[PDB]
Amino acid sequence: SMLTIVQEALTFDDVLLLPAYSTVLPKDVSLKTRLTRGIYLNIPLVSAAMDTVTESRMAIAMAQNGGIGILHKNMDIAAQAAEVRRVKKFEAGYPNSCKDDLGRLRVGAAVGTGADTPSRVEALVEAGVDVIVVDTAHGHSAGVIERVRWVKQNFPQVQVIGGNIATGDAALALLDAGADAVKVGIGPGSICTTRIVAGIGMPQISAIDSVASALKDQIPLIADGGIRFSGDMAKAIGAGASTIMVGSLLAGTEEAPGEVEFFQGRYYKAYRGMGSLGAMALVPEGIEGRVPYKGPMGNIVHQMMGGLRSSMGYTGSAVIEDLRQNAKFVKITSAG
Amino acid sequence: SMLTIVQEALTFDDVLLLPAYSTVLPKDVSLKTRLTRGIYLNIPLVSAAMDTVTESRMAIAMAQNGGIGILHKNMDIAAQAAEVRRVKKFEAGYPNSCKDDLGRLRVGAAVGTGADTPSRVEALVEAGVDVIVVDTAHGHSAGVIERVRWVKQNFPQVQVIGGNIATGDAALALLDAGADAVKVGIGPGSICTTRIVAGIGMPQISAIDSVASALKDQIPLIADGGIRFSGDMAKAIGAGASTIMVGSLLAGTEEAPGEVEFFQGRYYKAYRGMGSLGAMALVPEGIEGRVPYKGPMGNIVHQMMGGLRSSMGYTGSAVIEDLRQNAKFVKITSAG
Amino acid sequence: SMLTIVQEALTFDDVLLLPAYSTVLPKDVSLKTRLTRGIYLNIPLVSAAMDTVTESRMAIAMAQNGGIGILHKNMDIAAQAAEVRRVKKFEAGYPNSCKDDLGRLRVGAAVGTGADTPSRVEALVEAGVDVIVVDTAHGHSAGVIERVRWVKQNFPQVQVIGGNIATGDAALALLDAGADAVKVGIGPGSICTTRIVAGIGMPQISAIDSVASALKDQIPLIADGGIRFSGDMAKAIGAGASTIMVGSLLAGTEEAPGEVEFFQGRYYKAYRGMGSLGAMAKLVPEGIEGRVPYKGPMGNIVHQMMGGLRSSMGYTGSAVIEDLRQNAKFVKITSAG
Amino acid sequence: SMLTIVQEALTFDDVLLLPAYSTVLPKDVSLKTRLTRGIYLNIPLVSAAMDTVTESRMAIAMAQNGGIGILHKNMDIAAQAAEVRRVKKFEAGSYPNSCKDDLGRLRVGAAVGTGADTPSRVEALVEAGVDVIVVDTAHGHSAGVIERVRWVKQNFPQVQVIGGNIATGDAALALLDAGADAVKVGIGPGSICTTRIVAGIGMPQISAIDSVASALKDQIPLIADGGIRFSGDMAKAIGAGASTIMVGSLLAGTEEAPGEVEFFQGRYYKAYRGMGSLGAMALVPEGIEGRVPYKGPMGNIVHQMMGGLRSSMGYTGSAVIEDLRQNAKFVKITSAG
Amino acid sequence: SMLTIVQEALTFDDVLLLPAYSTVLPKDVSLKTRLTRGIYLNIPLVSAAMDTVTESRMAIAMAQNGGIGILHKNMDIAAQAAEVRRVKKFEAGSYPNSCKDDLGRLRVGAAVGTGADTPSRVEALVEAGVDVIVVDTAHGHSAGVIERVRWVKQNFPQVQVIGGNIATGDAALALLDAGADAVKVGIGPGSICTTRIVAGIGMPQISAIDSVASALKDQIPLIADGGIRFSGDMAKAIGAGASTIMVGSLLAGTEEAPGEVEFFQGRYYKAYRGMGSLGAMAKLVPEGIEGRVPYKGPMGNIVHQMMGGLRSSMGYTGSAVIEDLRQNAKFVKITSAG
Ligand SMILES: C[C@H](Nc1ccc2ncc(CO)cc2c1)C(=O)Nc1ccc(Cl)c(N(C)C)c1
Ligand SMILES: C[C@H](Nc1ccc2ncc(CO)cc2c1)C(=O)Nc1ccc(Cl)c(N(C)C)c1
Ligand SMILES: C[C@H](Nc1ccc2ncc(CO)cc2c1)C(=O)Nc1ccc(Cl)c(N(C)C)c1
Ligand SMILES: C[C@H](Nc1ccc2ncc(CO)cc2c1)C(=O)Nc1ccc(Cl)c(N(C)C)c1
Ligand SMILES: C[C@H](Nc1ccc2ncc(CO)cc2c1)C(=O)Nc1ccc(Cl)c(N(C)C)c1
Ligand SMILES: O=c1[nH]cnc2c1ncn2[C@@H]1O[C@H](COP(=O)(O)O)[C@@H](O)[C@H]1O
Ligand SMILES: O=c1[nH]cnc2c1ncn2[C@@H]1O[C@H](COP(=O)(O)O)[C@@H](O)[C@H]1O
Ligand SMILES: O=c1[nH]cnc2c1ncn2[C@@H]1O[C@H](COP(=O)(O)O)[C@@H](O)[C@H]1O
Ligand SMILES: O=c1[nH]cnc2c1ncn2[C@@H]1O[C@H](COP(=O)(O)O)[C@@H](O)[C@H]1O
Ligand SMILES: O=c1[nH]cnc2c1ncn2[C@@H]1O[C@H](COP(=O)(O)O)[C@@H](O)[C@H]1O
Numbered sequence A, B: 001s002m003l004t005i006v007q008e009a010l011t012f013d014d015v016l017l018l019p020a021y022s023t024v025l026p027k028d029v030s031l032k033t034r035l036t037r038g039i040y041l042n043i044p045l046v047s048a049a050m051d052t053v054t055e056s057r058m059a060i061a062m063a064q065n066g067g068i069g070i071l072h073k074n075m076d077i078a079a080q081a082a083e084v085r086r087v088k089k090f091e092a093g094y095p096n097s098c099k100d101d102l103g104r105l106r107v108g109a110a111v112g113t114g115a116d117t118p119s120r121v122e123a124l125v126e127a128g129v130d131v132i133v134v135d136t137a138h139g140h141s142a143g144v145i146e147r148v149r150w151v152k153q154n155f156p157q158v159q160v161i162g163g164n165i166a167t168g169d170a171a172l173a174l175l176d177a178g179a180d181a182v183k184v185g186i187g188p189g190s191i192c193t194t195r196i197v198a199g200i201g202m203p204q205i206s207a208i209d210s211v212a213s214a215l216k217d218q219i220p221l222i223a224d225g226g227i228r229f230s231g232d233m234a235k236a237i238g239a240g241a242s243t244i245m246v247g248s249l250l251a252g253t254e255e256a257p258g259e260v261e262f263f264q265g266r267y268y269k270a271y272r273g274m275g276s277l278g279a280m281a282l283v284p285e286g287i288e289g290r291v292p293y294k295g296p297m298g299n300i301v302h303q304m305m306g307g308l309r310s311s312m313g314y315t316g317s318a319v320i321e322d323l324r325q326n327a328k329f330v331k332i333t334s335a336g
Numbered sequence C: 001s002m003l004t005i006v007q008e009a010l011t012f013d014d015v016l017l018l019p020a021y022s023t024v025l026p027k028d029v030s031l032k033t034r035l036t037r038g039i040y041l042n043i044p045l046v047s048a049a050m051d052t053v054t055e056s057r058m059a060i061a062m063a064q065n066g067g068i069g070i071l072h073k074n075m076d077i078a079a080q081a082a083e084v085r086r087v088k089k090f091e092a093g094y095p096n097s098c099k100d101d102l103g104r105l106r107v108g109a110a111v112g113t114g115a116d117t118p119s120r121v122e123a124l125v126e127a128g129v130d131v132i133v134v135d136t137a138h139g140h141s142a143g144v145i146e147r148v149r150w151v152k153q154n155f156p157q158v159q160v161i162g163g164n165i166a167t168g169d170a171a172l173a174l175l176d177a178g179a180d181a182v183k184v185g186i187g188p189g190s191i192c193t194t195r196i197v198a199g200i201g202m203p204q205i206s207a208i209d210s211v212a213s214a215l216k217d218q219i220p221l222i223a224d225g226g227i228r229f230s231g232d233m234a235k236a237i238g239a240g241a242s243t244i245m246v247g248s249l250l251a252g253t254e255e256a257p258g259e260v261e262f263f264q265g266r267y268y269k270a271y272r273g274m275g276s277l278g279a280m281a282k283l284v285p286e287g288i289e290g291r292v293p294y295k296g297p298m299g300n301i302v303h304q305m306m307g308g309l310r311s312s313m314g315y316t317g318s319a320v321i322e323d324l325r326q327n328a329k330f331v332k333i334t335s336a337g
Numbered sequence D: 001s002m003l004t005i006v007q008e009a010l011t012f013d014d015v016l017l018l019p020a021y022s023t024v025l026p027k028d029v030s031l032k033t034r035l036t037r038g039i040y041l042n043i044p045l046v047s048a049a050m051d052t053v054t055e056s057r058m059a060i061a062m063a064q065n066g067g068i069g070i071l072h073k074n075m076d077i078a079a080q081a082a083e084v085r086r087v088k089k090f091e092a093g094s095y096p097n098s099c100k101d102d103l104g105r106l107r108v109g110a111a112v113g114t115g116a117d118t119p120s121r122v123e124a125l126v127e128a129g130v131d132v133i134v135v136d137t138a139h140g141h142s143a144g145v146i147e148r149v150r151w152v153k154q155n156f157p158q159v160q161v162i163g164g165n166i167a168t169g170d171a172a173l174a175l176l177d178a179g180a181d182a183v184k185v186g187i188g189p190g191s192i193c194t195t196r197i198v199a200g201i202g203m204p205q206i207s208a209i210d211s212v213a214s215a216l217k218d219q220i221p222l223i224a225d226g227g228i229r230f231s232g233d234m235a236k237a238i239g240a241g242a243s244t245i246m247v248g249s250l251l252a253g254t255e256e257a258p259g260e261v262e263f264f265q266g267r268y269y270k271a272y273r274g275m276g277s278l279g280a281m282a283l284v285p286e287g288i289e290g291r292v293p294y295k296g297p298m299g300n301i302v303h304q305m306m307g308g309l310r311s312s313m314g315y316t317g318s319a320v321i322e323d324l325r326q327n328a329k330f331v332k333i334t335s336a337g
Numbered sequence E: 001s002m003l004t005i006v007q008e009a010l011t012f013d014d015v016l017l018l019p020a021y022s023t024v025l026p027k028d029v030s031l032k033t034r035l036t037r038g039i040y041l042n043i044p045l046v047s048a049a050m051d052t053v054t055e056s057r058m059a060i061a062m063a064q065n066g067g068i069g070i071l072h073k074n075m076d077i078a079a080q081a082a083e084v085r086r087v088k089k090f091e092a093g094s095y096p097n098s099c100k101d102d103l104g105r106l107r108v109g110a111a112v113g114t115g116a117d118t119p120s121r122v123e124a125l126v127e128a129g130v131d132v133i134v135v136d137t138a139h140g141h142s143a144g145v146i147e148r149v150r151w152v153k154q155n156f157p158q159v160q161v162i163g164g165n166i167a168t169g170d171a172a173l174a175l176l177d178a179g180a181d182a183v184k185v186g187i188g189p190g191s192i193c194t195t196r197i198v199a200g201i202g203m204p205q206i207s208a209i210d211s212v213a214s215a216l217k218d219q220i221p222l223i224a225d226g227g228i229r230f231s232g233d234m235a236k237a238i239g240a241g242a243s244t245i246m247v248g249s250l251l252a253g254t255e256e257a258p259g260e261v262e263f264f265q266g267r268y269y270k271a272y273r274g275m276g277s278l279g280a281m282a283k284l285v286p287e288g289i290e291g292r293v294p295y296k297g298p299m300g301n302i303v304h305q306m307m308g309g310l311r312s313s314m315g316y317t318g319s320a321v322i323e324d325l326r327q328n329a330k331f332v333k334i335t336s337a338g
Helices: A056-064 A077-088 A117-126 A142-154 A168-176 A194-198 A204-215 A230-239 A297-315 A320-326 B056-064 B077-088 B117-126 B142-154 B168-176 B204-215 B230-239 B297-315 B320-326 C056-064 C077-088 C117-126 C142-154 C168-176 C204-215 C230-239 C298-316 C321-327 D056-064 D077-088 D118-127 D143-155 D169-177 D195-199 D205-216 D231-240 D298-316 D321-327 E056-064 E077-088 E118-127 E143-155 E169-177 E195-199 E205-216 E231-240 E299-317 E322-328
Strands: A015-017 A045-047 A068-071 A108-111 A131-135 A159-165 A181-184 A221-224 A243-246 A261-263 A266-272 A288-292 A329-332 B005-009 B015-017 B045-047 B068-071 B108-111 B131-135 B159-165 B181-184 B221-224 B243-246 B261-263 B266-272 B288-292 B329-332 C005-009 C015-017 C045-047 C068-071 C108-111 C131-135 C159-165 C181-184 C221-224 C243-246 C261-263 C266-272 C289-293 C330-332 D005-009 D015-017 D045-047 D068-071 D109-112 D132-136 D160-166 D182-185 D222-225 D244-247 D262-264 D267-273 D289-293 D330-332 E015-017 E045-047 E068-071 E109-112 E132-136 E160-166 E182-185 E222-225 E244-247 E262-264 E267-273 E290-294 E331-334
Touching: A015 A230, A015 A297, A045 A056, A045 A297, A056 A068, A056 A077, A056 A297, A068 A077, A068 A131, A077 A108, A077 A117, A108 A117, A117 A131, A117 A142, A131 A142, A142 A159, A142 A168, A159 A168, A159 A221, A168 A181, A168 A204, A181 A204, A204 A221, A204 A230, A221 A230, A230 A243, A230 A297, A230 A320, A230 A329, A297 A320, B005 B204, B015 B230, B015 B297, B045 B056, B045 B297, B056 B068, B056 B077, B056 B297, B068 B077, B068 B131, B077 B108, B077 B117, B108 B117, B117 B131, B117 B142, B131 B142, B142 B159, B142 B168, B159 B168, B159 B221, B168 B181, B168 B204, B181 B204, B204 B221, B204 B230, B221 B230, B230 B243, B230 B297, B230 B320, B230 B329, B297 B320, C005 C204, C015 C230, C015 C298, C045 C056, C045 C298, C056 C068, C056 C077, C056 C298, C068 C077, C068 C131, C077 C108, C077 C117, C108 C117, C117 C131, C117 C142, C131 C142, C142 C159, C142 C168, C159 C168, C159 C221, C168 C181, C168 C204, C181 C204, C204 C221, C204 C230, C221 C230, C230 C243, C230 C298, C230 C321, C230 C330, C298 C321, D005 D205, D015 D231, D015 D298, D045 D056, D045 D298, D056 D068, D056 D077, D056 D298, D068 D077, D068 D132, D077 D109, D077 D118, D109 D118, D118 D132, D118 D143, D132 D143, D143 D160, D143 D169, D160 D169, D160 D222, D169 D182, D169 D205, D182 D205, D195 E231, D195 E299, D205 D222, D205 D231, D222 D231, D231 D244, D231 D298, D231 D321, D231 D330, D298 D321, E015 E231, E015 E299, E045 E056, E045 E299, E056 E068, E056 E077, E056 E299, E068 E077, E068 E132, E077 E109, E077 E118, E109 E118, E118 E132, E118 E143, E132 E143, E143 E160, E143 E169, E160 E169, E160 E222, E169 E182, E169 E205, E182 E205, E205 E222, E205 E231, E222 E231, E231 E244, E231 E299, E231 E322, E231 E331, E299 E322
Parallel strands: A045 A068, A045 A243, A068 A108, A108 A131, A131 A159, A159 A181, A181 A221, A221 A243, A329 B005, B045 B068, B045 B243, B068 B108, B108 B131, B131 B159, B159 B181, B181 B221, B221 B243, B329 C005, C045 C068, C045 C243, C068 C108, C108 C131, C131 C159, C159 C181, C181 C221, C221 C243, D005 E331, D045 D068, D045 D244, D068 D109, D109 D132, D132 D160, D160 D182, D182 D222, D222 D244, E045 E068, E045 E244, E068 E109, E109 E132, E132 E160, E160 E182, E182 E222, E222 E244
Antiparallel strands: A015 A329, A261 A266, A266 A288, B015 B329, B261 B266, B266 B288, C015 C330, C261 C266, C266 C289, D015 D330, D262 D267, D267 D289, E015 E331, E262 E267, E267 E290
């Protein structure tokens, strides 16, 4: 009677996209989309700001495949600015490359809300960073809203992203602060334990829908966490996402940080949450594990974009915006 | 909210047929039905157009038991036309046999939308094929709609089927194109990975219902994919299907293509999706595996038809059309 | 849309009974109920008409504990009438015993719709059977409806049950035929494969509710099949059942037919569906053949199952079976609950 | 010490045959061998005398492929003699490797016990044209078996006689002395066998064959009965001293084997049970009752087994069965190997 | 090398009995044997002195089938003597194979320790009419057991005495010189036993029986105590040199065994625990586990299945009497593959 149930929230496995009239072949579809209101990517993939996913090596390949990588903040201001420079000064000895006005590969960097943030932001913009990601566990906070407002007023020459959020109210708050894009994701990550530890969360399909409906395409959103297959990406874009941030899928690849480990005859790479005991050294909100060796990241990216191309062919979507505006879904049961 | 949820789509496991007043015994029911608006079968079974399910041997046996087999297109025009001739020229040394006006066993053949289709269609009709199946992964496309219209206009002496579809709008499109029957099924196949790779699909009970409700019995529909038991067949017919296409159930049988393999003391036969890496040599949308040796196909067909007879006895359906028009269902939970 | 979905049907695991104001202790509740409009039992338990559950030995113990056993029809007319006689002529060398007007232990017998049915029915009534169970897989048939009408017209001195059913329309049909009780159950049995083979069924809580709502307490119903625990029995009675038929729970007990088998150090007894390949030896099987572990004397299982139903009546404030039947309140639970 | 350990007995998995100098290709080897001192087979395979393995159908297919079937005794004298006649009167509607008698009729064997109906059974089988009488019990080193084989040889010298089951050299000499034309070796190795657990009796098959063969000194052949899972076991058995191999498990589940195909959980199976199981007897049971997967025509399985044996003879440099029997060299392997 | 490896010790699963020439059918064999030098049983079966196996009910049933029951010591002197009286005063309201004394009363045995209450316990049990006193500890080759056995024989010559538990020939000779009428063999083979893990002490049962039997030279019989899972183990034990077999696990879970039936996860069970478990003791570290065995129903069924299997074994070896199997059995050693 007094319990407030806002809605029955839906995840990726709760829905399926419906096929519609199509005259487009998967090989002919355009994967071009917008990361912010000022930055466009050639593929809707964004590599996760994590110490086991993105560093300079991963950020180069992402951009080289038409996407973008967000360097993690679990490194000192000097280390992060040095990683930005490595991506910006990289020269090929890739026609679908994601580059700036000066023909340099695009890169992003993650920042907190704390005391070293003004020095961190200044050093990253100076190093030539394209986008600043003001990212915490709870983006619907004065700390994130006001830190986003600070970066837009003091550094208008750089694009700013606010995260993480899962409601329409949070999106309007960050829109008013001057965010160029919002990062959507509260509890969906594969290594995430936020739901068990805090009982806080919002299944990703309803999270994207809530944010996208409030924004009214004024700024794009990044669907962050919980992508296991190429089908999830199509559902995310269909629900309202402009891009998709992945961690698990890019972890274990050659380009990801960490050396290959030989455990029980097989090859693995470490994969851990940024809120895990190992990543922090608050009660932990993430796990530490090992993912199998996937080889060059290019293979995984091609296989994922291949699946999204087929989905766009099934929905009759020639461009990303066609899938975003015309997608029709069906709700499925546990049997389906 | 901006998210468009058309309906809560239902699969076979989501529903159960209700028993109704009955004066008919299972051994007395008529399994006679229509494959197309010109072809009638003695049983509602159709063998899948797959390189591990239907070739000349399987088509003969399907036709001998009162069903029909669709010859696969993973062979050259000359091989496919020779397979049509093998079934049409077959002479028994079977009172329920499915035969044409000339007393020859009935056969069907699958065609694509590619460049070799006019030469393939012409050679199959010349070889005496009863039905042409214009089938792709996405039948709600200009490619399938216009090819179905081409076959009907250029070869009116042959029956044409369009597939695969899962919506009422797709059915009306193929109906207006001149299809004699529609093939329903987007994502329910046992070897299918369309749902994981593309995030596209429609649970089979809701797919059949949507198609059947739009058609208004103007042309029949084949419920294609996802049949595991004889109960699924009864649910499919009750939902609106006239015939049922099966791959998994007929794979592993003596008549199915492929030699028996002796693995770990047991006997198996290969079973693979037509969108698998092995079948194509687009990102794969099917798996490759082994099914246990089932022996002569006749046994499996009799067990399946036996179960459908019991269901018609429970519903008080003397004829297939009684189950199609009078069936009443209940929705069941994950506990049921 | 043209698809006809009558309702979202519920099973035992879909619901939970709510506790209500209570002044009654579980040890003080009355388990007395009615099998038919003429037969009353001291406990709501009925043993299944199965060749691995009820024969003379099981019907005696069920009647001794307050219940009733239904003898199976997978035996000739002479064998079945002899089994009726064994129960009726049994003398103790049990205060809650279910007995007739002549002080003899009560017994039931299953009959089909086939050609031997008039000879079978006549021989069972002559042997002193209390209730005739006209039992097939599909009781909403002319075969069952007309046979129940034949038994009532030709043998009014005996009580008649019709089954199996799962809808209100089927219940009204058997009520108009003169059935004294209806047996509810289409697809909930533990050994049943009707749902996989025919795609036919009705989850038991919705089946009981549909039948009970149509009947309006004119004749009782036997909730037949799908009982795994004592909680299911309380849910069944709360949904509208007057009695409960069990097979799996009484299988494996000392009293059940079959000799104990020593497999891999443990002790088991056979348990099979009446539509299995082995039980039938035409129709495709609709039941499985298996082994249940040895449970020892049936008395232990009956006491545990009646103990659980007593606690439930204590939780609902139900002093008598009719209090649970008329006052029970439920909540629907998800797959998480 | 008082404990008498005769030897460390070896099974199939304890040994491996060594490859030796070879000039023979597997396709060129001769699989011809002797079943008895008077009967020769074209392949060293025998189908077990079991109610789920050999009846007339299996015996015809066995004979057609160059082997022989031993019809089971779990049927009356009239039915068993009718099964012998069915094999002897069989005419092809082509099998060049067919095992046939002097009159060009397919060869067949029949199992007999030591019971009271044995003289009537033996007389009726010889009259029906049986080629070999198998006096087979669980314990062939008994007065019952020894004297019955001696009775068959003295009263019916026109027929070949086999004695079994045995596992020692002393048992072989006893049966050789009574006039057996061949001995059957196997105490405890059967796949469905529980003799080892129930009686604590047994002898691993490689040591059982070796013990029997060493005592006989090729005077009469021996049949390696039980425990064959793969084509490699057959080569090890022949190398150890066997002239033929009896199989039950491998031929069970085939089209030709007795029993109808059963559809359990989507798959196809056939029954397979020990002759000392509760079901086969209706002594404490010494065998289990189970289901084997449907293998289709027996011909496929036989070709796979004879193919594997051909490769083995190619590896050993064995042109004829007798070359493998006399020249095979083995190595003992550990639990790691 | 300085490490002393006495032998490669063998268990039940390491050996198989060989079939030999036979003229006697399993239904015709004699299962009669001797428990002590003065007591004979009609079947070679003894129920274990455990609080979840043998109380008066199990002992009555054991004797009625021709065996004997050893009453446990995890009860006061008055209760144990009352259990002896219950078996001795039992009268049938038919069991032709019953194991009875000179006065036609069902035979019974009782377990005693080496503790301070032992003289009062022994005196009260003999007074109650006990047939055999079992001086049983975890280690029978101790001054405590040897001297207590010697005390019982000297002070109560009218009663039979058993000494246990032992696993060597030296131990057997020590108890033989003490005046034991029979020895109980079993160090570490118990199903609920953890002696091997806790102390690293043990001797596989086939070699334990062989070592004891070879030293004794049939002067006194031995009871194969512990590690019997099937009827085949019993035949191997007798063939190795045992006159009787003590079983705990096989008789636990039966109707006659102490404890009420428990309904866990739809099934019926009875408790079964080691006498050296935490629960049985309530300052030695535990040497046994506490568990549940499935409900087996009347003990008669289990006993008939075991004696049936042993009958077949004697019919395979050509053993008309127990002594034929004991003296003529031939074995083969098998590998992990066999
Ligand atoms: C330890 C935990 N770790 C992380 C780390 C990275 C994360 N990244 C994303 C998400 C979204 O599920 C959660 C995350 C939690 C974490 O930051 N908790 C956490 C919980 C509640 C609040 Cl209000 C805050 N504010 C930002 C101070 C932080
Ligand atoms: C590789 C995959 N393979 C298959 C093959 C056979 C199938 N057969 C049936 C179904 C039913 O979902 C799917 C199938 C997918 C496939 O064809 N994908 C696919 C995906 C989207 C589009 Cl728009 C198209 N159009 C026909 C060009 C094809
Ligand atoms: C083979 C099966 N076997 C059984 C046997 C006993 C049963 N007893 C109860 C139930 C309740 O689901 C089903 C049963 C099925 C069975 O009777 N099928 C069956 C199916 C449909 C109809 Cl219309 C009929 N009519 C009565 C002739 C019979
Ligand atoms: C019940 C058992 N069943 C079988 C049946 C077939 C067998 N066939 C082969 C083997 C060899 O392991 C054992 C078998 C046991 C069986 O015959 N026991 C059995 C045990 C010992 C003896 Cl002395 C005898 N004599 C012949 C009377 C019989
Ligand atoms: C706790 C343990 N419990 C038991 C109880 C009964 C047993 N019964 C048999 C066996 C055979 O290993 C071991 C047993 C251990 C036990 O008594 N240990 C134990 C260990 C070493 C010694 Cl020298 C002694 N002496 C008698 C004082 C006792
Ligand atoms: O420890 C953590 N707790 C919760 N979420 C985390 C943690 N570390 C990273 N994340 C989020 O999870 C995403 C990775 O999601 P995934 O692709 O499902 O592995 C990241 O991009 C973050 O938004
Ligand atoms: O690779 C594939 N991907 C998806 N669906 C497939 C593929 N190959 C065949 N199918 C469909 O799956 C059906 C077989 O369904 P099944 O009876 O559930 O095995 C075929 O008749 C096709 O409609
Ligand atoms: O083979 C069969 N198929 C379907 N239902 C069966 C079969 N045999 C018995 N039944 C039903 O299942 C009940 C037993 O239900 P249980 O208590 O869940 O084991 C019986 O009382 C019958 O109503
Ligand atoms: O119940 C039984 N107990 C023990 N051995 C058996 C039984 N029935 C048959 N056998 C033997 O086991 C053989 C079959 O061995 P398999 O090829 O390993 O299955 C038969 O030829 C018999 O010698
Ligand atoms: O806790 C214990 N530790 C070790 N052995 C025990 C314990 N309790 C009883 N035993 C022995 O184990 C035997 C039971 O053996 P079982 O038949 O294999 O269960 C008893 O007769 C004792 O000799």
